Amino acid sequence: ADTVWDPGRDLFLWAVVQNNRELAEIGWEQCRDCIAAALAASKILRKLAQESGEDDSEEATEMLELAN
Amino acid sequence: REETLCELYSHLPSCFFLRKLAKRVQGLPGSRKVCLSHVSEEVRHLLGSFTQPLYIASRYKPADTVWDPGRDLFLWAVVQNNRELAEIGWEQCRDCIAAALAASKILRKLAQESGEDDSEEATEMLELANHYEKQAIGVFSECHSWDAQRAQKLLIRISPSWGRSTCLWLALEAHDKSFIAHSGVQALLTQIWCGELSVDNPHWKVLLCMIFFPLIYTGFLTFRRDEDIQRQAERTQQKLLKPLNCSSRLMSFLKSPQVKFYWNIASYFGFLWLFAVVLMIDFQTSPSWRELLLYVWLTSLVCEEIRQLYHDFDGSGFRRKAKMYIKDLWNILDVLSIVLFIAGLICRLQASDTVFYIGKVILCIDFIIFCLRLMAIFSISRTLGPKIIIVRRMMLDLFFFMFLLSIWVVAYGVAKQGILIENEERLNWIIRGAVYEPYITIFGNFPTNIDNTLFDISSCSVNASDPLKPKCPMLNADNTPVFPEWLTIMMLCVYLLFANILLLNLLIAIFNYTFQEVQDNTDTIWKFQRYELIKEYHSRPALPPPFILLSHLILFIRGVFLRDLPQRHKNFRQELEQTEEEELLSWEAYMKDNY
Amino acid sequence: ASDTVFYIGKVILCIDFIIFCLRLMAIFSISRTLGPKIIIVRRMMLDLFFFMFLLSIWVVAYGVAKQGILIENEERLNWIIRGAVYEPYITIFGNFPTNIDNTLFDISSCSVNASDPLKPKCPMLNADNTPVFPEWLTIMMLCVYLLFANILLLNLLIAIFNY
Numbered sequence: 001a002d003t004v005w006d007p008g009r010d011l012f013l014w015a016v017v018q019n020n021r022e023l024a025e026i027g028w029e030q031c032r033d034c035i036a037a038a039l040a041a042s043k044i045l046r047k048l049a050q051e052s053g054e055d056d057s058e059e060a061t062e063m064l065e066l067a068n
Numbered sequence: 069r070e071e072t073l074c075e076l077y078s079h080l081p082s083c084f085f086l087r088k089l090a091k092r093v094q095g096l097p098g099s100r101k102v103c104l105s106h107v108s109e110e111v112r113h114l115l116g117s118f119t120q121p122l123y124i125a126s127r128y129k130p131a132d133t134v135w136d137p138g139r140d141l142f143l144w145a146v147v148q149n150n151r152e153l154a155e156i157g158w159e160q161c162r163d164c165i166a167a168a169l170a171a172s173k174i175l176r177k178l179a180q181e182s183g184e185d186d187s188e189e190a191t192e193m194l195e196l197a198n199h200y201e202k203q204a205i206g207v208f209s210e211c212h213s214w215d216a217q218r219a220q221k222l223l224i225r226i227s228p229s230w231g232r233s234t235c236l237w238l239a240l241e242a243h244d245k246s247f248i249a250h251s252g253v254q255a256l257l258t259q260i261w262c263g264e265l266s267v268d269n270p271h272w273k274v275l276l277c278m279i280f281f282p283l284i285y286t287g288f289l290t291f292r293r294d295e296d297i298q299r300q301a302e303r304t305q306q307k308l309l310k311p312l313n314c315s316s317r318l319m320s321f322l323k324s325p326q327v328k329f330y331w332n333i334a335s336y337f338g339f340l341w342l343f344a345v346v347l348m349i350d351f352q353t354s355p356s357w358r359e360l361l362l363y364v365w366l367t368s369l370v371c372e373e374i375r376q377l378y379h380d381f382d383g384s385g386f387r388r389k390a391k392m393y394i395k396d397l398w399n400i401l402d403v404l405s406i407v408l409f410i411a412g413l414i415c416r417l418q419a420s421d422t423v424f425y426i427g428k429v430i431l432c433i434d435f436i437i438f439c440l441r442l443m444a445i446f447s448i449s450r451t452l453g454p455k456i457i458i459v460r461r462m463m464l465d466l467f468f469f470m471f472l473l474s475i476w477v478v479a480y481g482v483a484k485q486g487i488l489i490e491n492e493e494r495l496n497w498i499i500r501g502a503v504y505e506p507y508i509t510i511f512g513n514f515p516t517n518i519d520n521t522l523f524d525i526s527s528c529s530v531n532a533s534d535p536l537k538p539k540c541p542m543l544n545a546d547n548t549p550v551f552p553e554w555l556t557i558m559m560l561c562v563y564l565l566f567a568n569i570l571l572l573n574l575l576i577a578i579f580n581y582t583f584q585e586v587q588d589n590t591d592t593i594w595k596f597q598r599y600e601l602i603k604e605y606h607s608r609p610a611l612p613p614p615f616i617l618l619s620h621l622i623l624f625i626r627g628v629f630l631r632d633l634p635q636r637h638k639n640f641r642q643e644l645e646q647t648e649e650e651e652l653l654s655w656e657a658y659m660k661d662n663y
Numbered sequence: 664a665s666d667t668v669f670y671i672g673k674v675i676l677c678i679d680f681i682i683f684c685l686r687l688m689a690i691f692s693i694s695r696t697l698g699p700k701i702i703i704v705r706r707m708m709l710d711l712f713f714f715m716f717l718l719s720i721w722v723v724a725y726g727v728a729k730q731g732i733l734i735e736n737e738e739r740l741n742w743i744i745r746g747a748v749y750e751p752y753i754t755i756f757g758n759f760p761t762n763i764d765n766t767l768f769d770i771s772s773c774s775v776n777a778s779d780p781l782k783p784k785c786p787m788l789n790a791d792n793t794p795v796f797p798e799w800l801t802i803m804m805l806c807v808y809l810l811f812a813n814i815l816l817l818n819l820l821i822a823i824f825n826y
C-alpha cells in the first residue's frame with residue numbers, strides 16, 4: 001500500500017512489455033534507480049519469453065537478447 | 069508473339085539441362101528448332117510426376133495453360149543457373165510465393181541428379197536454392213503479420229501458372245526446413261489436424277471424451293462452431309453461419325482426424341494381441357472359430373487398401389494412380405505383409421503334414437512385417453527417394469569393411485589349424501574349426517579367450533571319434549604338444565590386437581559418425597512427420613478396421629450411383645472464385661514490393 | 664496388533680528411509696526452484712519413453728515369432744509370457760558368445776503334456792534328438808535381431824542421454 005508515484009518507471013515499463021529495443025533505451029535514463037529497473041526488466045522479459053509458446057521468431061531472439 | 073521465346077530456349081548456354089534436352093531430341097546455339105512441349109516434358113521430370121504439363125503446343129495465349137509472360141523469363145533464367153538474371157526475372161512475376169518454391173525444388177533436383185560435375189552443382193545450385201527459400205519465407209512472413217487470416221487462404225489455393233499445383237505441396241515436397249519451422253504453417257496444420265473440434269483442448273480431454281460419449285455433450289470440450297459464433301457475432305456487433313444443432317455434433321466429432329488416429333491405433337494393438345494369441349496358444353489342424361476373425365479382419369484391411377489406391381488422388385489414369393501409389397513406402401510394407409499372409413493362407417489348408425509347418429513359419433514372418441509396420445508410423449518418413457541416398461553408401465562401406473575383416477579371420481583360422489593338426493579327412497570339422505571358432509573368438513573376453521591345452525575333449529586314437537570330437541593336436545611326448553603353447557598365445561595376442569582394435573574402431577567410427585550426424589541434424593523432424601500423418605488419417609473413413617467394410621458398403625454403393633464427395637480434398641486444395649483471385653494476387657504483389 | 668499389517672508397516676518405514684536418504688542428497692546437489700526442473704525432465708522423460716516403446720515393439724515381435732516356429736501349442740499362459748517377453752528382453756544385454764544357448768533337449772520336458780516343476784515344453788522333434796527346424800536359422804535370426812536391437816537403438820538412447 002506504499003505505491004509511490006514515479007514517472008520515470010512508467011515509460012520504461014510500457015516500453016519493456018511490448019519489446020521495443022530502441023524506445024526502452026530512451027526510457028531507461030529517465031529512471032530514478034537503475035540497478036533495480038534493469039533487473040526487473042530482465043526478469044519480465046525472460047518470463048514473457050518463456051510462456052509464449054506459439055511464436056518463436058520473436059520470443060526467442062528479441063526477448064532473450066534484450067534481457068541479456 | 070510466339071516463337072521468339074522458342075529461339076530464346078534455342079540460344080541457352082552449355083548446361084546439364086541442355087544436355088538432358090539434347091538427349092531428349094534424339095528420339096551448337098542457333099542451329100536447332102526446339103518445340104516447347106519438348107521442354108515441358110523435362111520440366112515435368114524436374115518438377116514432379118504429379119503436376120500437369122506447362123506448355124501445350126500451338127495453344128499459346130488462347131489443359132488450363134494460362135499465358136503469363138512473367139513466369140517465362142524466370143524459368144528460363146533458373147534452369148541455366150544464372151544468379152543475377154533470375155533476380156531481375158523474379159520481380160516481373162505475378163505470384164511470388166509459388167515461383168520461389170518451384171525454383172527451389174527445380175534447383176535441388178537438378179543439383180542432385182548431376183553426378184559428374186560437383187564444382188557447379190553443389191555450391192551454386194544449393195546456395196541459389198537456399199536463397200529463393202529465404203525470399204519466399206520473407207514474403208510470407210511479411211504477409212502473415214498484416215492480416216494473419218488471408219495468409220492461410222494464400223497457402224492453400226491452386227495456382228494455374230505452375231502446373232495446377234498448390235503452394236504447400238511445393239513447400240513440403242522439396243524438404244524446405246525453414247519454411248516449415250515458421251509459425252503460420254504450423255498454425256494451419258494444427259487447424260487441419262484438430263478438425264471440427266476447436267484448439268486448446270488438452271490431450272487427455274480428447275481421449276476421456278472418446279471413452280465416455282456424453283461427456284463431450286456436457287460442455288467439456290470447446291468446439292469450433294460455438295466459439296466462432298460466440299466471438300464473431302458478438303465482437304462485430306458490440307463494437308458497432310448456422311448454430312450446431314441436436315444430432316449433428318456426433319458426426320462432427322466422429323469426422324475429426326485427431327480422434328480417428330487414436331481409434332485406429334487402438335484397433336491395431338487389438339489386432340496384434342489377437343494374432344499373438346492365435347499364433348501361439350491355438351493353431352489347430354482345423355481352423356478354429358478364433359482364427360476366422362483373423363481372415364475377416366484381413367479382408368476388411370485389403371478392401372481398405374484398395375480404396376486408398378482408388379481415391380487418394382484424382383489422376384483418372386490407371387498408370388497415373390498406380391505409379392504414384394507404389395512410390396510410397398508404408399504401402400510397400402503393407403503390400404508385402406498382405407502377400408505373405410495370402411501365401412500362408414494358401415499353404416495352411418494343405419491337408420498334408422509337410423506344408424503345415426512351412427505355413428506357420430510364413431505366418432510368423434508376416435507377424436514380423438506387421439510389427440514393423442507399427443514402427444514405420446511413428447519413426448520413418450514417407451518419401452521413397454531420400455532413404456536410398458544414405459542406405460546405399462553406408463551399406464556399401466559396411467560391406468567393404470566386413471569383407472576386409474573376413475579375409476583376416478580366414479587367414480588366422482587356416483594357419484592355426486594348419487600348424488598343429490594331422491590332415492583331417494572330414495570336411496565339416498575343417499570349416500567348423502577354421503571359420504567358426506576364430507569368428508567367435510574375437511568377441512570373447514581376453515582372459516576367457518585363452519582356452520589352450522593339449523587334451524581335454526579331442527579324441528584321435530582310432531581315426532576320428534564321431535560324437536562331436538575334433539581330432540587331437542599331434543603329440544611328440546605323452547601329454548604334450550610338439551608346438552609350444554606360448555607361440556599359440558603370442559600369435560593369439562597379435563591376431564587379437566589387430567582384429568579387436570584397429571578394424572572395429574573404424575566400423576564404430578563410421579556408424580557413430582552417421583548416428584551423430586543424424587541425431588544432431590535438426591529439431592524439425594517431428595514437425596515434418598506431423599504432415600505425413602495428416603493426409604492418410606485425414607482421408608480415411610471414421611469407423612475402425614473391424615467395421616471398415618460397413619463403410620465400404622456405403623461408399624461403394626454411393627460411388628456408382630451418383631458422384632459423392634465432389635471436393636475430394638476441401639481443407640487442402642481450393643479453387644478460388646475469379647473475382648476474388650485478382651484482389652488476392654494484388655495484395656501479395658503489394659506486400660512483395662513493401663518487402 | 665494383527666500380524667497381517669505388521670509386515671506392511673515395516674515396508675512403509677523402509678520406503679520412508681529411502682525418502683530421508685534422498686533428502687540428504689537434495690541439500691548438496693539439487694537446487695531449490697520448482698520451475699526449471701520440469702522444463703528438461705518432461706522432454707527427456709518423454710523422448711526416453713518414446714524410444715523405449717520403439718524397442719519394446721521389436722523385442723515382442725522377435726519373441727512371439729521365435730516361440731511361434733519351434734513349439735507345439737502351449738496350453739499354459741504363464742510359460743507363454745515367460746518365454747515370449749522375458750527371455751528376449753534378458754537376451755539383448757547378454758554377451759554374444761554367451762547368448763548362443765541353443766540345443767534341442769537339456770531341461771525341457773514334454774513327454775506327458777507339460778512337466779509342472781519349472782520345465783518349458785520341448786521343441787518339436789522329427790527324428791530322435793533333433794529339431795525339425797535347423798539350428799543355423801535360429802543363429803542367423805538371432806544375429807539379425809541382436810545386431811538391430813544391440814546397436815542401432817541403444818546408440819540413439821546413449822546419444823540423447825549423453826548429449
Ligand SMILES: [Ca+2]
Nearest residue numbers: 373376399402
Ligand atoms: Ca495404406
